Amino acid sequence: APDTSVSNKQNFSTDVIYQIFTDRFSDGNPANNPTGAAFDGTCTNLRLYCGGDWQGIINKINDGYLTGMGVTAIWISQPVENIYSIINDSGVNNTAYHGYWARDFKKTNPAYGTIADFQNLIAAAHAKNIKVIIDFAPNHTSPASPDQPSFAENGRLYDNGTLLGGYTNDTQNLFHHNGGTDFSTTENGIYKNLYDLADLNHNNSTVDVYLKDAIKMWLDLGIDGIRMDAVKHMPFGWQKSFMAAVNNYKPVFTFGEWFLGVNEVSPENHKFANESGMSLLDFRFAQKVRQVFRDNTDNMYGLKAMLEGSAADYAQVDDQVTFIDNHDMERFHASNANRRKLEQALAFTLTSRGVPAIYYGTEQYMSGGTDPDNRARIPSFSTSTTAYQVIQKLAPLRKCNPAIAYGSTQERWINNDVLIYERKFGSNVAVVAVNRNLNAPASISGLVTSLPQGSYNDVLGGLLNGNTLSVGSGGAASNFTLAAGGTAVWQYTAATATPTIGHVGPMMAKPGVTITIDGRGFGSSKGTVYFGTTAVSGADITSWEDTQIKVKIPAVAGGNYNIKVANAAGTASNVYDNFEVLSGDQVSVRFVVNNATTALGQNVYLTGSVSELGNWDPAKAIGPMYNQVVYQYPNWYYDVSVPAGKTIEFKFLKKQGSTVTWEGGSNHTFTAPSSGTATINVNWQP
Numbered sequence: 074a075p076d077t078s079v080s081n082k083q084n085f086s087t088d089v090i091y092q093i094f095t096d097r098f099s100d101g102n103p104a105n106n107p108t109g110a111a112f113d114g115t116c117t118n119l120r121l122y123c124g125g126d127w128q129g130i131i132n133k134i135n136d137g138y139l140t141g142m143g144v145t146a147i148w149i150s151q152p153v154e155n156i157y158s159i160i161n162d163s164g165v166n167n168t169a170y171h172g173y174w175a176r177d178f179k180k181t182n183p184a185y186g187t188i189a190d191f192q193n194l195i196a197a198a199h200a201k202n203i204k205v206i207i208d209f210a211p212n213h214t215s216p217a218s219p220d221q222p223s224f225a226e227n228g229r230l231y232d233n234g235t236l237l238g239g240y241t242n243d244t245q246n247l248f249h250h251n252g253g254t255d256f257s258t259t260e261n262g263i264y265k266n267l268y269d270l271a272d273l274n275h276n277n278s279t280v281d282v283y284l285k286d287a288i289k290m291w292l293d294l295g296i297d298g299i300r301m302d303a304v305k306h307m308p309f310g311w312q313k314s315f316m317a318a319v320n321n322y323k324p325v326f327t328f329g330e331w332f333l334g335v336n337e338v339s340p341e342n343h344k345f346a347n348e349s350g351m352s353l354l355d356f357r358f359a360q361k362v363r364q365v366f367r368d369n370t371d372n373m374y375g376l377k378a379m380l381e382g383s384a385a386d387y388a389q390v391d392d393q394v395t396f397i398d399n400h401d402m403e404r405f406h407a408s409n410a411n412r413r414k415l416e417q418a419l420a421f422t423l424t425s426r427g428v429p430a431i432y433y434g435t436e437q438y439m440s441g442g443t444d445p446d447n448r449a450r451i452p453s454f455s456t457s458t459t460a461y462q463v464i465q466k467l468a469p470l471r472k473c474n475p476a477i478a479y480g481s482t483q484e485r486w487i488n489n490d491v492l493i494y495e496r497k498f499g500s501n502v503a504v505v506a507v508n509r510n511l512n513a514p515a516s517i518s519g520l521v522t523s524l525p526q527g528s529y530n531d532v533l534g535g536l537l538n539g540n541t542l543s544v545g546s547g548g549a550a551s552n553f554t555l556a557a558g559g560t561a562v563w564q565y566t567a568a569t570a571t572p573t574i575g576h577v578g579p580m581m582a583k584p585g586v587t588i589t590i591d592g593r594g595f596g597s598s599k600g601t602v603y604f605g606t607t608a609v610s611g612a613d614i615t616s617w618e619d620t621q622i623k624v625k626i627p628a629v630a631g632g633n634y635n636i637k638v639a640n641a642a643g644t645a646s647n648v649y650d651n652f653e654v655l656s657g658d659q660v661s662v663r664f665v666v667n668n669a670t671t672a673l674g675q676n677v678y679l680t681g682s683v684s685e686l687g688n689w690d691p692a693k694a695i696g697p698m699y700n701q702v703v704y705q706y707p708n709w710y711y712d713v714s715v716p717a718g719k720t721i722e723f724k725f726l727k728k729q730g731s732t733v734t735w736e737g738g739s740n741h742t743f744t745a746p747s748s749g750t751a752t753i754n755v756n757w758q759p
């Protein structure tokens with residue numbers, strides 16, 4: 074099938090995600106509605122169940138609400154069974170309507186529906202070319218008190234009805250008992266409780282295996298993608314091993330949530346997205362968009378800096394999931410603000426690089442403060458809104474104009490309030506003009522583009538006061554006036570002749586796994602696929618077409634490879650880097666080195682004989698290691714993803730900048746478990 078097919082679980086770049094709070098969307102089956110003080114059909118009390126369910130979602134798919142909008146994917150709340158207890162906070166009754174308080178990852182939340190309702194959801198969706206994404210929060214269970222075991226469900230964890238354990242009397246050590254995080258450090262927010270949520274111990278084989286098995290069930294249920302909750306709160310090493318479990322089984326688009334604040338730029342964030350085997354929700358993008366379009370705390374020069382910076386920081390920028398708001402922030406639209414602010418932000422998001430995500434209700438100009446004011450019930454299903462028509466006109470461009478889905482981004486004109494960018498991919502072009510100034514028009518002159526000679530109509534049809542564009546020779550555009558609050562989209566599409574790689578997924582897996590290569594101009598006849606210098610052809614290429622190729626990963630040594638294709642004629646394409654080949658199936662192992670004294674600013678890293686350890690390359694060493702929570706300096710620790718059952722040689726190193734100090738003596742050795750976890754405790758060798 075084509076790259077734009079609904080069957081494409083590896084690529085969402087051409088889609089438009091619609092984030093749905095199940096409970097707050099549509100109650101299609103009143104029979105499964107929670108009763109008593111846990112329910113509020115009037116949805117006046119936003120901390121209780123309102124009745125939203127999967128059936129309701131199906132109804133909205135079948136009636137044309139979502140399809141008419143141009144939405145090609147839906148991201149729903151966590152489907153797993155949540156606690157049934159009504160948590161009373163200082164007089165405020167609280168329920169697990171959000172689905173974030175898991176009690177059993179192998180069962181569904183009855184309020185949402187049964188397993189059969191879920192299966193029906195997948196079918197109905199797929200039938201309308203809509204992909205299904207599920208929220209997955211394996212960082213914790215529920216709110217618990219080690220003190221008062223009577224509080225909530227004591228964060229109890231069940232395995233398909235079978236009680237595994239609780240936060241109180243945790244003899245098995247399923248959870249972390251390190252207190253609560255203050256978000257002070259990364260390590261602090263990782264090994265300590267997120268709020269009062271019972272923190273899961275991923276270093277426990279039981280938890281490790283259980284979680285990896287739970288997801289496999291969902292995978293089997295036909296999901297097309299996963300949104301990983303609180304990724305900055307779980308060990309990176311375990312998550313990688315988790316991604317490998319998914320990838321080496323049934324690959325699906327996965328993106329996690331790594332909360333970033335205003336003007337917050339984390340290098341840890343970048344590394345995670347680049348090496349974890351999963352992408353992230355673009356918090357850098359969302360925050361900046363809000364500054365520029367919402368609060369006006371930054372200008373177009375800031376938006377531009379964000380675009381060009383992110384493009385350099387993310388190996389796969391096109392994989393980052395963009396948004397303007399969500400269930401954890403104030404809704405973009407302020408009740409007293411000009412709607413044109415939201416419309417423009419929408420238009421910008423839909424035409425920018427990455428994977429656009431729209432928080433349900435946006436199209437309806439919903440306003441609301443922080444949680445839970447931002448999670449009100451959708452007030453209507455009207456298609457007559459401007460924001461609705463905007464998405465409806467721009468959404469589809471992601472499927473018909475590859476420049477928007479995989480294209481580069483280039484600034485072609487800029488000032489405080491105006492921004493004109495160009496998206497380009499192969500013989501495809503898209504030019505977007507935005508004027509955030511709602512009071513003053515802008516005189517556009519000297520604009521140059523990649524558009525062919527001719528006249529271009531505004532894709533938005535003037536909806537946002539857009540205009541036509543006249544392009545002469547050299548793509549030089551005729552002088553024009555950009556109206557206040559004006560937004561215009563111009564484009565040009567044409568068949569690509571040369572093989573052009575626009576996307577790859579999964580980005581990490583072991584040999585034998587089938588990956589997906591999307592782009593243009595691959596030809597209809599099988600060509601050759603290159604993993605570094607290794608050529609692949611014939612049978613291993615399970616599928617080949619102009620826009621998509623399906624090939625199995627060759628049995629090459631573990632490492633980082635550049636992907637490249639060639640058509641039947643021998644014409645090579647562009648390179649697609651950062652593709653990681655695993656040494657095999659993965660396990661999560663905790664490494665511990667004792668008596669490793671360092672100087673302030675100097676950290677300890679881990680290196681080893683496997684690609685998962687950097688193959689003895691200090692530039693690729695694991696770390697910096699931790700030394701606060703679980704173990705304390707001069708004791709360091711770190712959870713790493715390593716090939717299972719493999720006998721690995723390793724050493725530790727002290728690094729300051731690029732300067733390296735090796736551990737003395739001989740290499741440490743050990744055989745990775747074939748399953749579950751392990752803990753390697755060693756002493757620094759002088």
Ligand SMILES: OC[C@H]1O[C@H](O[C@H]2[C@H](O)[C@@H](O)[C@@H](O[C@H]3[C@H](O)[C@@H](O)[C@@H](O[C@H]4[C@H](O)[C@@H](O)[C@@H](O[C@H]5[C@H](O)[C@@H](O)[C@H](O)O[C@@H]5CO)O[C@@H]4CO)O[C@@H]3CO)O[C@@H]2CO)[C@H](O)[C@@H](O)[C@@H]1O
Nearest residue numbers: 258670671672673674675676677697698699700701706707
């Ligand atoms: O802001 C967070 C912080 O976290 C990480 O810091 C790393 C360091 O980069 C690593 O070096 C390591 O730190 C170790 C030191 O290596 C080790 O020597 C020891 O440090 C002692 C010092 O010996 C002592 O002099 C004391 O220094 C003073 C400073 O002189 C003063 O300027 C400052 O105001 O206060 C300190 C505290 O008195 O500091 C400690 C006292 O025990 O112990 C630490 C381990 O804690 O590991 C940490 C991670 O925990 C990031 O790498 C770093 O960039 C970031 O700044």
Ligand SMILES: OC[C@H]1O[C@H](O[C@H]2[C@H](O)[C@@H](O)[C@@H](O[C@H]3[C@H](O)[C@@H](O)[C@@H](O)O[C@@H]3CO)O[C@@H]2CO)[C@H](O)[C@@H](O)[C@@H]1O
Nearest residue numbers: 682688689690722723724734735736737738739740741
């Ligand atoms: O050239 C191939 C070489 O590769 C591998 O050697 C690695 C060592 O096993 C490993 O210990 C590490 O060596 C460092 C020492 O530990 C340290 O004391 C000091 O001597 O620096 C060394 C790094 O230069 O890294 C090397 C790889 O560079 C393999 O195991 C060897 O058999 C082989 O000779």
Ligand SMILES: OC[C@H]1O[C@H](O[C@H]2[C@H](O)[C@@H](O)[C@@H](O)O[C@@H]2CO)[C@H](O)[C@@H](O)[C@@H]1O
Nearest residue numbers: 484485486487488489517518519520521
């Ligand atoms: O003419 C090419 C030129 O176009 C753009 O420059 C704009 C600039 O952004 C405006 O602020 C204003 O000064 O008009 C210029 C047109 O002359 C691009 O920004 C620039 O890179 C490019 O060279």
Ligand SMILES: [Ca+2]
Nearest residue numbers: 102106124126
């Ligand atoms: Ca219901």
Ligand SMILES: [Ca+2]
Nearest residue numbers: 263272306307
């Ligand atoms: Ca945690």
